[PDB]
Amino acid sequence: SHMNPKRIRALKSGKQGDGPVVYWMSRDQRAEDNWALLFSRAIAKEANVPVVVVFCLTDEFLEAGIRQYEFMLKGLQELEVSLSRKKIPSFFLRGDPGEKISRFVKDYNAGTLVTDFSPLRIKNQWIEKVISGISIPFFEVDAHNVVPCWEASQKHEYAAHTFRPKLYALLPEFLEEFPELEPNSVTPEETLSDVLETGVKALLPERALLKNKDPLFEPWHFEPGEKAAKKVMESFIADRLDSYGALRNDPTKNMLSNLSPYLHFGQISSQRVVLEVEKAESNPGSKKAFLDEILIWKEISDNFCYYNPGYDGFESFPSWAKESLNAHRNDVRSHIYTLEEFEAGKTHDPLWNASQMELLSTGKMHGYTRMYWAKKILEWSESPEKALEIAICLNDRYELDGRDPNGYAGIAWSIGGVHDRAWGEREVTGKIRYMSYEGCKRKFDVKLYIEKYS
Numbered sequence: 001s002h003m004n005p006k007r008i009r010a011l012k013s014g015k016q017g018d019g020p021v022v023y024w025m026s027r028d029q030r031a032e033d034n035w036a037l038l039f040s041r042a043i044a045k046e047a048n049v050p051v052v053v054v055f056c057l058t059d060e061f062l063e064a065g066i067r068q069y070e071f072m073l074k075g076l077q078e079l080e081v082s083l084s085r086k087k088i089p090s091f092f093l094r095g096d097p098g099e100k101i102s103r104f105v106k107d108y109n110a111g112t113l114v115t116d117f118s119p120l121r122i123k124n125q126w127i128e129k130v131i132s133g134i135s136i137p138f139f140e141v142d143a144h145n146v147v148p149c150w151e152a153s154q155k156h157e158y159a160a161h162t163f164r165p166k167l168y169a170l171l172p173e174f175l176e177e178f179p180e181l182e183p184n185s186v187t188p189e190e191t192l193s194d195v196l197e198t199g200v201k202a203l204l205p206e207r208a209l210l211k212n213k214d215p216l217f218e219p220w221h222f223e224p225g226e227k228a229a230k231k232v233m234e235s236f237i238a239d240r241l242d243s244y245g246a247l248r249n250d251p252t253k254n255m256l257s258n259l260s261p262y263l264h265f266g267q268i269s270s271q272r273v274v275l276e277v278e279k280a281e282s283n284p285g286s287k288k289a290f291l292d293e294i295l296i297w298k299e300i301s302d303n304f305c306y307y308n309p310g311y312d313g314f315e316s317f318p319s320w321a322k323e324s325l326n327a328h329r330n331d332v333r334s335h336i337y338t339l340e341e342f343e344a345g346k347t348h349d350p351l352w353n354a355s356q357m358e359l360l361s362t363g364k365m366h367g368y369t370r371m372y373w374a375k376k377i378l379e380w381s382e383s384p385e386k387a388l389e390i391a392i393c394l395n396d397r398y399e400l401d402g403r404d405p406n407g408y409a410g411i412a413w414s415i416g417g418v419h420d421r422a423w424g425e426r427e428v429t430g431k432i433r434y435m436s437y438e439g440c441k442r443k444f445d446v447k448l449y450i451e452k453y454s
């Protein structure tokens with residue numbers, strides 16, 4: 001087995017039991033290229049026990065909507081089949097992790113517990129509870145980042161150009177092929193259709209609809225699951241990669257990878273993706289541009305959430321920005337929109353409303369327009385605290401890749417200059433990098449973007 005010990009972290013001591021090794025899957029919903037699954041199999045081998053997979057359908061998802069819930073569970077049904085063809089049983093527990101994972105460990109005489117890693121507050125909520133209801137050893141493995149989150153840095157990194165040296169210096173040690181997942185020796189000692197049916201009915205009153213009372217979301221932009229995530233990656237390498245560096249900041253092109261929803265649910269590994277992109281021969285500049293995103297910005301987001309408890313609040317902005325935004329707290333805002341208005345794209349700005357339409361109808365706003373979109377919320381909000389609330393809310397309710405450290409870090413960047421520099425000082429937004437509507441007229445084909453979305 002080729003398993004780096006620095007990818008793993010003890011969450012609780014225990015006395016090991018004598019039953020299956022239980023992998024509690026959460027962030028990384030895949031069978032292939034999954035260090036958490038791979039380490040859980042290795043421990044089960046070393047203990048002559050089978051490895052099983054447990055997943056919690058939590059009392060939440062009523063906070064998001066059908067788009068995300070469907071994307072995830074369609075992926076998971078494919079995952080049962082996948083893990084079956086490995087003789088690895090998957091149990092799907094309804095309810096919150098505290099109660100259900102504790103009970104599952106007791107009832108199935110688990111030996112050791114392993115989970116994947118996520119810096120989000122809620123996961124730690126779950127962890128705190130699970131830790132009370134078990135007396136067996138507990139491990140988490142960083143299956144999401146290429147360089148483990150507690151390895152990459154010992155602290156918060158204020159700019160990309162400080163985290164980047166540290167991260168690149170560790171790629172030799174941490175970027176490499178996955179061993180194949182070795183199946184179970186034997187097959188060991190209600191369904192997602194019913195559960196998908198039950199939840200959808202519970203969520204259908206909150207579904208987003210255009211006045212016409214017809215549904216607003218379009219499923220077909222992203223086929224969910226592990227097999228489809230490979231295909232999308234392959235389409236990217238083959239077709240969009242060469243142009244990426246040139247056209248990534250242009251909302252009128254389909255030249256992005258479109259991997260974020262897949263990467264969010266962990267239906268595809270970012271280590272895998274990075275390995276394929278490294279292999280490929282493409283226009284100079286492109287490969288550097290894309291790796292800068294999927295290694296530096298993706299992994300600094302986990303860094304941000306992990307070293308900042310208040311990663312979703314003003315207090316985590318850098319000094320200069322807080323000082324700056326405080327000084328402009330009482331400036332009169334040129335507009336103030338209610339939440340409903342932002343949500344239904346009813347602002348005096350045709351480009352903002354279009355970006356909000358792309359979101360509502362596809363569940364994926366273009367990266368470039370996300371920055372415009374979020375900065376305008378700062379500008380048209382009672383306060384910077386309210387701006388974060390509104391952005392976090394809209395991002396999490398409607399993005400397929402939402403509810404993600406990339407989100408909080410991305411919104412903090414936009415609204416408080418996290419991982420950014422001081423810029424020209426203005427009214428209302430202070431020194432926070434400004435993104436004028438006109439700057440977009442210079443930079444890309446605005447009117448065409450607006451036509452695409454109405």
Ligand SMILES: Cc1cc2nc3c(=O)[nH]c(=O)nc-3n(C[C@H](O)[C@H](O)[C@H](O)COP(=O)(O)OP(=O)(O)OC[C@H]3O[C@@H](n4cnc5c(N)ncnc54)[C@H](O)[C@@H]3O)c2cc1C
Pocket residue numbers: 248256257258259260261263264293294295297298299301365366367368370371374395399401402403404406407408410411414
């Ligand atoms: C206001 C705002 C909100 C955001 N919310 C989210 C979110 O909820 N979930 C999310 O995954 N990303 C978020 N981002 C970052 C980024 O916009 C998206 O990850 C990207 O557009 C996803 O599309 P893609 O896969 O085609 O990107 P590509 O250009 O094809 O990049 C490939 C991968 O690199 C990573 N990546 C690219 N850009 C960034 C970035 N700026 N920050 C962190 N990682 C990046 C993503 O994981 C992405 O899947 C947000 C950015 C902003 C400004």
Ligand SMILES: O=c1nc2n(C[C@H](O)[C@H](O)[C@H](O)CO)c3cc(O)ccc3cc-2c(=O)[nH]1
Pocket residue numbers: 025026027055056057058060061064068069072117118120123264265400401402403
């Ligand atoms: O373990 C779970 N992870 C879920 N996740 C994954 C989430 O990324 C992780 O729970 C955290 O990263 C902590 O592991 C969701 C993500 C979404 O975007 C939307 C809904 C869910 C729902 C669940 C869930 O019910 N259980």
